[PDB]
Design a protein around this ligand. Structure first.
Ligand SMILES: C[S@@+](CC[C@H](N)C(=O)[O-])C[C@H]1O[C@@H](n2cnc3c(N)ncnc32)[C@H](O)[C@@H]1O
Ligand SMILES: [Ca+2]
Ligand SMILES: [Ca+2]
Ligand SMILES: [Zn+2]
Ligand SMILES: [Zn+2]
Ligand SMILES: [Zn+2]
Length: 217
């Protein structure tokens, strides 16, 4: 059984950490029509989607059928946690996911470098080998360990089927997972941690890909 965690829907800023807000002047304005085949969708000419911005619902001309509100809408593909051989607990999809489709948001407690330094330090001193830390920016780190969602079970892979993207939503950064290719129902959902994830120093990569570098990210 996986150790408990508080299931949260949005990022939770801790201590000095701030969650900022901008106006409509700091957001592009697309010209997608309600009559388009997939208004503001994965293959459209939506200037907001292209610049990694969501559309503002009350001003998007595509209106009600705007397809560029994936973070705000929190509609994720059906997933489940399962027991992997060597990388502990993992996350697999229960439904087919298409290339470029939104998979999840990396949601956790938003912490600063001082709080992140104390939590790695405690984990190191107490032989904790599982980390759920992801850089939002130089000032803010997502920690999905105490509080999070299903994204926290997604393992690293040198040949992943997902990627992270830094999007602007309501005037602040959010981290989302998007499919790098079509993913079949039953497959483990992975992403390359790259330099984004903290604490995994001397961790040996067990992704088992033919192009494995031996290290996490
Ligand atoms: C975000 S958690 C992923 C869920 C985790 N496997 C669990 O059981 O809760 C990442 C942690 O899982 C382990 N891990 C993830 N991907 C791995 C990989 N490719 N090779 C080895 N360990 C991995 C590491 O201990 C890492 O700190
Ligand atoms: Ca729009
Ligand atoms: Ca818009
Ligand atoms: Zn659009
Ligand atoms: Zn739109
Ligand atoms: Zn690997």
């Amino acid at each position: 059984k996986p150790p408990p965690y508080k299931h949260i829907k949005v990022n939770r800023p801790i201590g000095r950490v701030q969650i900022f807000t901008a106006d409509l002047s700091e957001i592009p304005r697309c010209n997608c029509k309600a009559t388009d085949e997939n208004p503001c969708g994965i293959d459209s000419e939506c200037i907001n989607r292209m610049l990694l911005y969501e559309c503002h619902p009350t001003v998007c001309p595509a209106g009600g059928r705007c397809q560029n509100q994936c973070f705000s809408k929190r509609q994720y593909p059906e997933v489940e946690i399962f027991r992997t051989l060597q990388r502990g607990w993992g996350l697999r999809t229960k439904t087919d996911i298409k290339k470029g489709e939104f998979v999840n948001e990396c949601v956790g407690e938003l912490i600063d470098e001082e709080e992140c330094r104390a939590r790695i330090r405690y984990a190191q001193e107490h032989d904790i080998t599982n980390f759920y830390m992801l850089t939002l920016d130089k000032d803010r780190i997502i920690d999905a360990g105490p509080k999070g969602n299903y994204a926290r079970f997604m393992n690293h892979c040198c040949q992943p089927n997902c990627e992270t993207q830094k999007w602007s939503v309501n005037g602040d950064t959010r981290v989302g997972l998007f499919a790098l290719s079509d993913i079949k129902a039953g497959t483990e959902l992975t992403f390359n941690y790259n330099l984004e994830c903290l604490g995994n120093g001397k961790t040996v990569c067990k992704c088992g890909a033919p192009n494995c570098s031996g290290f996490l990210g």
